[PDB]
Amino acid sequence: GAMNSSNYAELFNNDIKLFVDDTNVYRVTVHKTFEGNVATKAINGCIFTLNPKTGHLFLKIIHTSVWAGQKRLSQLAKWKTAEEVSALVRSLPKEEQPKQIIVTRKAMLDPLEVHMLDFPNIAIRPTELRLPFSAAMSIDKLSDVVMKATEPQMVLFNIYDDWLDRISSYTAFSRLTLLLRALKTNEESAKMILLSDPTITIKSYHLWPSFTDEQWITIESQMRDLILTEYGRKYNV
Amino acid sequence: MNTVPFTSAPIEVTIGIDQYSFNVKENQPFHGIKDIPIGHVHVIHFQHADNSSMRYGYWFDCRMGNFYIQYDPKDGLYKMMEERDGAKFENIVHNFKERQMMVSYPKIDEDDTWYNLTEFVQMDKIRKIVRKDENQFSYVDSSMTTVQENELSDPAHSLNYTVINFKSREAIRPGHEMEDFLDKSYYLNTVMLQGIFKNSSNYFGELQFAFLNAMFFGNYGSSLQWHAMIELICSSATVPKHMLDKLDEILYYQIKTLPEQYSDILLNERVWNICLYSSFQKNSLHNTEKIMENKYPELL
Ligand SMILES: O=C(O)/C=C/c1ccc(N2CCCC2=O)cc1
Prior knowledge:
The complex is a heterodimer.
Chain A: E1 17-21, E2 27-32, E3 38-43, E4 45-50, E5 56-62, H1 73-91, E6 100-103, H2 109-115, E7 123-125, H3 140-148, E8 153-158, H4 169-185, H5 187-195, H6 213-235
Parallel strand pairs in A: 1-6, 6-7
Antiparallel strand pairs in A: 1-4, 2-3, 4-5, 5-8
Helix pairs in contact in A: 1-2, 4-5, 4-6, 5-6
Chain B: E1 2-5, E2 13-17, E3 20-24, E4 32-36, E5 42-48, E6 51-60, E7 67-72, E8 77-82, H1 86-98, E9 103-104, H2 113-118, H3 123-129, E10 138-141, H4 147-151, H5 177-182, H6 185-197, H7 200-217, H8 220-234, H9 241-257, H10 263-266, H11 269-278, H12 286-295
Parallel strand pairs in B: 4-9
Antiparallel strand pairs in B: 1-4, 2-3, 2-5, 5-6, 6-10, 7-8
The complex binds (2E)-3-[4-(2-oxopyrrolidin-1-yl)phenyl]prop-2-enoic acid (V5O).
Family (chain B): Belongs to the AAR2 family.
Function (chain B): Component of the U5 snRNP complex that is required for spliceosome assembly and for pre-mRNA splicing. Involved in splicing pre-mRNA of the A1 cistron and other genes that are important for cell growth.
Subcellular location (chain B): Cytoplasm; Nucleus
């Protein structure tokens, strides 16, 4: 059924599962026309499909040409997401196919269920977690590949870099969600925190800086402070 | 005009005949129902005074044989039977009629209600939904499940309605997922009408039968089928115009006949609000929308 904080450790068991977030698939800027009406201009988007146990991220880049001449784009985007997730599953070897797909938004349930009718044993589930995956486009290397794309493209990443050498997947996921929540709440300050120190760099093959264990503790505390600071700014606390 | 005689009425019971109902007290001179209009299917149904559990009844057509009712004290119900001795049957009926021991089917001349509820319903199709091949009539009761209800448990005693499932491979062409889910026309016209039912008359017949079993027996699986068959049409952008006009008439007479006090349990708010106000056919059912809004504005 639905996925919440009671059964949270289920995310890190040995049943292959994927999160799917569609919040960055259909992206637009809104602007005035010469006649003073309003128009949208699409920009490239992405499907965010993540294995929370291994950190493997299947980033399908959605090029603006897929919207050309189409109507009801916000509805189309959910079905296109479902189509692409189905195509990804079919492309994987049987023993790599997920047993569960968790959608971050309930409006993805019916589109994904209909596209996956051929896989009656893959469970399609919502979640009661509020996951900050929309902020993935605040990760510089991910935003860069999406915006440079001139055609549809799938790019594979490990969103945990090399962290699983030192920490469990439960802890890696908690670190990721804290980082993305901070980037969602105050992107400038979060990137300031992550990059302030020039002697800690991002390896060419990584998305995040090469923090020691002790520095990750400091970074995590600074991110919690940012979130708390912003909470107080928002509600005047 | 035809007749369903009763051997006797040993237990007090409310007897239904089509949309009419009357009470018989435990021993009275009750020997059946006369003046039944030839040309329609009919249903004779029962609710016992001392145990309203199990409404049950029998669909029949007087053109297919001579039928009568006899109480069975072992199985504790009124049973329909066929009399093959035609001369015996005619003499029994004549005597009861000469004795004024039968109630008259109480049809008003002006009243087309029963035709309007059974226009497309045929005995032959009833007997394929309700499988008991040694009888020319068909038993239905309040608790019988449908084939679809069983898939989700005695198959011989089931209602074999046509399974309708909007999230099934039958309903959704590979490659046309969004199209077929948001617009059920493929499922309606190719799968169901061309494929399974062959024509809209058989579709409407099963739709009407489902409604009548829901109304007369409180059969929940029948109510589900009735609403499914409505929603399938209303959720299709492409429906033959004659089907839409006929559906509007069908539904109008069903809503007109529904007892006002059973509306809470026989009408699905979601289906009706979607069909009348959101669906492709939201503006195609003018008669049905008018009676629904005047009779059941609460549901809407
Ligand atoms: O509920 C009611 O209002 C009427 C019930 C009723 C009326 C008439 C009869 N008759 C007619 C023939 C012999 C006989 O018993 C039986 C019940």
